[PDB]
Write an enzyme that holds these catalytic residues in place. Structure first.
Site, mmCIF file in Angstrom:
data_model
loop_
_atom_site.group_PDB
_atom_site.id
_atom_site.type_symbol
_atom_site.label_atom_id
_atom_site.label_comp_id
_atom_site.label_asym_id
_atom_site.label_seq_id
_atom_site.Cartn_x
_atom_site.Cartn_y
_atom_site.Cartn_z
ATOM 1 N N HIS A 1 0.847 -1.175 0.000
ATOM 2 C CA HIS A 1 0.000 0.000 0.000
ATOM 3 C C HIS A 1 0.894 1.240 0.000
ATOM 4 C CE1 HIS A 1 -2.607 3.201 1.446
ATOM 5 N NE2 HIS A 1 -3.606 2.490 0.957
ATOM 6 N N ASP B 1 1.051 4.463 0.945
ATOM 7 C CA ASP B 1 1.373 5.114 2.216
ATOM 8 C C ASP B 1 2.368 4.281 3.021
ATOM 9 O OD1 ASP B 1 -0.272 7.366 1.792
ATOM 10 O OD2 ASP B 1 -2.011 6.406 2.699
ATOM 11 N N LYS B 2 2.119 2.981 3.074
ATOM 12 C CA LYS B 2 2.983 2.083 3.835
ATOM 13 C C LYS B 2 4.340 1.870 3.159
ATOM 14 C CE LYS B 2 1.719 1.159 7.929
ATOM 15 N NZ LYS B 2 2.962 1.908 8.273
ATOM 16 N N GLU C 1 10.863 12.310 5.026
ATOM 17 C CA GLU C 1 9.539 12.089 4.438
ATOM 18 C C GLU C 1 9.707 11.479 3.073
ATOM 19 O OE1 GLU C 1 7.427 12.509 6.587
ATOM 20 O OE2 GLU C 1 7.684 14.393 7.677
ATOM 21 N N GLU D 1 15.106 16.814 6.673
ATOM 22 C CA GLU D 1 16.311 17.404 7.282
ATOM 23 C C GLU D 1 17.059 16.323 8.037
ATOM 24 O OE1 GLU D 1 13.062 18.473 8.521
ATOM 25 O OE2 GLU D 1 12.947 19.379 6.526
ATOM 26 N N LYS E 1 -5.646 -4.117 1.566
ATOM 27 C CA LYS E 1 -6.322 -3.418 2.661
ATOM 28 C C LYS E 1 -7.311 -4.375 3.285
ATOM 29 C CE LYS E 1 -7.179 1.037 2.336
ATOM 30 N NZ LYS E 1 -7.963 2.244 1.952
ATOM 31 N N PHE F 1 -9.064 -5.004 -9.562
ATOM 32 C CA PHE F 1 -8.075 -4.242 -8.780
ATOM 33 C C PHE F 1 -6.693 -4.682 -9.297
ATOM 34 C CE2 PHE F 1 -6.442 -3.394 -4.092
ATOM 35 C CZ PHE F 1 -5.666 -2.338 -4.536
ATOM 36 N N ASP G 1 -2.653 5.119 -6.631
ATOM 37 C CA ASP G 1 -2.884 5.919 -5.431
ATOM 38 C C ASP G 1 -1.576 6.536 -4.918
ATOM 39 O OD1 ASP G 1 -4.242 6.997 -3.273
ATOM 40 O OD2 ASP G 1 -4.184 5.157 -2.062
ATOM 41 N N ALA G 2 -1.498 7.870 -4.862
ATOM 42 C CA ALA G 2 -0.318 8.538 -4.291
ATOM 43 C C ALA G 2 -0.163 8.191 -2.810
ATOM 44 C CB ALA G 2 -0.392 10.050 -4.471
ATOM 45 N N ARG H 1 0.738 8.610 6.866
ATOM 46 C CA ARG H 1 -0.682 8.680 6.511
ATOM 47 C C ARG H 1 -1.438 7.401 6.910
ATOM 48 N NH1 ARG H 1 -2.481 12.878 2.742
ATOM 49 N NH2 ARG H 1 -4.196 11.430 2.240
ATOM 50 N N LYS H 2 -0.807 6.591 7.766
ATOM 51 C CA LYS H 2 -1.442 5.413 8.321
ATOM 52 C C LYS H 2 -1.201 5.324 9.842
ATOM 53 C CE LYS H 2 -3.502 3.950 4.707
ATOM 54 N NZ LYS H 2 -3.839 5.395 4.534
ATOM 55 N N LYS I 1 11.870 9.050 11.674
ATOM 56 C CA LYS I 1 12.213 9.895 12.828
ATOM 57 C C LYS I 1 13.097 9.188 13.855
ATOM 58 C CE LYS I 1 8.083 12.712 12.700
ATOM 59 N NZ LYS I 1 6.712 12.819 13.247
ATOM 60 N N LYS J 1 12.760 12.895 18.279
ATOM 61 C CA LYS J 1 11.384 13.141 17.891
ATOM 62 C C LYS J 1 10.434 12.366 18.801
ATOM 63 C CE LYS J 1 13.482 14.863 14.128
ATOM 64 N NZ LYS J 1 14.969 14.952 14.019
ATOM 65 N N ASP K 1 7.360 12.310 19.097
ATOM 66 C CA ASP K 1 6.273 11.656 18.348
ATOM 67 C C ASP K 1 6.411 10.136 18.353
ATOM 68 O OD1 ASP K 1 4.797 13.916 17.481
ATOM 69 O OD2 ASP K 1 6.116 14.179 15.752
HETATM 70 K K LIG Z 1 8.716 16.876 8.682
HETATM 71 K K LIG Z 2 -3.861 9.355 -1.813
HETATM 72 MG MG LIG Z 3 5.224 17.304 10.138
HETATM 73 MG MG LIG Z 4 -3.618 7.615 1.565
#
Ligand SMILES: [K+]
Ligand SMILES: [K+]
Ligand SMILES: [Mg+2]
Ligand SMILES: [Mg+2]
Lengths: 369, 369
Positions: free
Chosen positions: B14, B16-17, B42, B55, B155, B224, B232-233, B238-239, B259, B263, B265
């Site tokens: 997928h 995003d993954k 990223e 960075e 999915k 599919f 799909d971008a 995003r997950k 990260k 970080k 997060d």
């Molecule tokens: K960032």
């Molecule tokens: K998308």
């Molecule tokens: Mg950010």
């Molecule tokens: Mg997405």
């Protein structure tokens, strides 16, 4: 019997939020020409670059250079001294566009949550509402020239001490505030910290919530000249908790910006907010969480769940029956009820999608039961 | 007195993954050479493109073409017939690298949540655990040649009916399962649906949770063939609900992948899981939510909050005191306790970061009180 709870927000010039606003500027541009545009626009921002990627089904002919650059101008990045400039930045387009309903299938699978709380008039947590308003206040003072040293990138964080009352929550005081904001080369740190306390915080936070023990972290890292996409890469849909409830309630994972109504990530989350707000404003509960889920190609939600935190005299099963009788949560009906083909989305992409501006999903439905 | 709850997961292919795994492949590569690397990588994926932006502060010299392409090979995109190919795709690098501690400041502001529930042995919600395992099962059968028609993008979504027991939750049955998976041009729909039920679902979900009323949405959109970055971008982070608790508990907004330990997060979310799991496995509660928050440049958390859902004999204030006495949640200590300079992160980037493989944050701390 008290507890702390913390939420954050970010300003318009924060790189993630730049990408959300551009993604929605693109969506609005398509919908102005084609109300039935299908858009999944992702944006990426880094030093000197905006990149658009995604899939579009639309009859619109959109000038991406003009739309993107005007969005960056609105935000306030208009000179290389600010680290980014709409006039001279790179814009790269990797969008793939093709030419081209009550019971339309959901555009994807996924789960979505709606939330409301009677602690504020706008039915939102105080922590996230204050955080948003601090960033809004910063943008106002930048744009009207009160604090000309301010630049567009900012972040705020608000920690509030609560007590609980039979599952409802009651704010007592603000415990801690953080503010970090991008600035010019000339302004000194003491002047910035003084202004953030007097002209921002004291203008935003009701005085009954501030006392002598309130902790202030103002420009806590020191100086912050390098900001925006230069200091930090940004992507669409990387501020989803800022966009919704600030840690309160729950989230299904889906981003909002750059997406049309068939993307239930957006439409069904907006509807679940509408349901949650309608239940609180109708007096059925004080605090409520609503889950929905969908399968791609299927119109009706797979599941609907109500959690009232013990704040209703009715059972959660009873509230579910009331929701089912008053709301049709298929994408093709939500689109009519919430007017989601209208090009109103760029205005949702900063300061949260909920608790402001009386968008259709913030106007409660009168419930028959 | 029952309720439905739904969670989703996605496979390695997928988009995003893909971006999460590449971002972590980059982080691991830096840490192999420089344990003190600071990374905010990223990734963006679209038809024929992988772009890296962010960075880095590091002494490592990393071959980005080799790292990215090997990660895409591992995932399984190795031919244009699958819509993406590690040998021939574009790789663009927009990373900005510079050359270059118990009480190190947090690398950013933010809030983070940890969660645990005694409904499963791994202290995770059943909904998300099953969803992950369905995707893992698909990858196994693809890679060992049992279902050679399978491609990497998938999915899944699992809806479970629960009952509640004094704030704890008890799974009764699986209500609905969705599976959508990318496939070759030759395989027919009936063969796919039959195989997804018999070889995937029945191999994964304990038979005591399946009955004749269980709803199966298998390849619900039909065919599919176009999948991965082509269909799909994708973007890093995003997950985030797939990565954590599937809608249960709460989330602070921060992504994990790409990260380093500074970080919070990532590091503080991992630690809060560790705290939450330690409280449940130590018998102090059955279900628990932990919040933390930080200011950039400041080492100690600004706030710590415990919510036990009424599943402890001790008050939430008492549990907070126990946490404070047993855990130091500064980034510079979490890094030692959880061994976060080790290049182990690519393995976290699919199938969730919690409830598997006995990573240090899944090994509970023995609590003194
Ligand atoms: K960032
Ligand atoms: K998308
Ligand atoms: Mg950010
Ligand atoms: Mg997405």
């Amino acid at each position: 019997g008290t507890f702390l709870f913390t939420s954050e927000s970010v300003g318009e010039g924060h790189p993630d939020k730049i990408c959300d606003q551009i993604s929605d500027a693109v969506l609005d541009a398509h919908l102005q020409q084609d109300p039935d545009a299908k858009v999944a626009c992702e944006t990426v921002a880094k030093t000197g670059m905006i990149l658009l990627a995604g899939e579009i089904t639309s009859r619109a002919a959109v000038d991406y250079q003009k739309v993107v650059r005007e969005a960056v101008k609105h935000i306030g990045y208009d000179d290389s001294s600010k680290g980014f400039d709409y006039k001279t930045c790179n814009v790269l387009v990797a969008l793939e566009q093709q030419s081209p309903e009550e019971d339309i299938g959901a555009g994807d699978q996924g789960l979505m949550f709606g939330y409301a709380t009677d602690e504020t008039e706008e039915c939102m947590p105080l922590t996230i509402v204050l955080a948003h308003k601090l960033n809004a206040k910063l943008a106002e003072l930048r744009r009207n020239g009160t604090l000309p040293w301010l630049r567009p990138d900012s972040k705020t964080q608000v920690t509030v001490q609560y007590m609980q009352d039979r599952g409802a929550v009651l704010p007592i005081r603000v415990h801690t505030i953080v503010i970090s904001v991008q600035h010019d080369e000339e302004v000194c740190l003491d002047e910035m910290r003084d202004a953030l306390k007097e002209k921002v915080i004291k203008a935003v936070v009701p005085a009954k919530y501030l006392d002598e023990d309130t902790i202030y972290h103002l420009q806590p890292s020191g100086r912050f000249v390098i900001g925006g996409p230069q200091g930090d890469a940004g992507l669409t849909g990387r501020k989803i908790i800022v966009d919704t409830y600030g840690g309160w309630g729950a989230h299904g994972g889906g981003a909002f910006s750059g997406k049309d109504y068939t993307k239930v990530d957006r439409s069904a989350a907006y509807a679940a907010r509408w349901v949650a707000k309608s239940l609180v404003k109708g007096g059925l509960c004080r605090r409520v969480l609503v889950q929905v889920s969908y399968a791609i190609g299927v119109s009706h939600p797979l599941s609907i769940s109500i959690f009232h935190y013990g704040t209703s005299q009715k059972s959660e099963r009873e509230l579910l029956e009331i929701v089912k009788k008053n709301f049709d949560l298929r994408p093709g009906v939500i689109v009519r009820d919430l007017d989601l083909k209208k090009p109103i989305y760029q205005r949702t992409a900063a300061y949260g999608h909920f608790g402001r501006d009386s968008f259709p999903w913030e106007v409660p439905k009168k419930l028959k039961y």
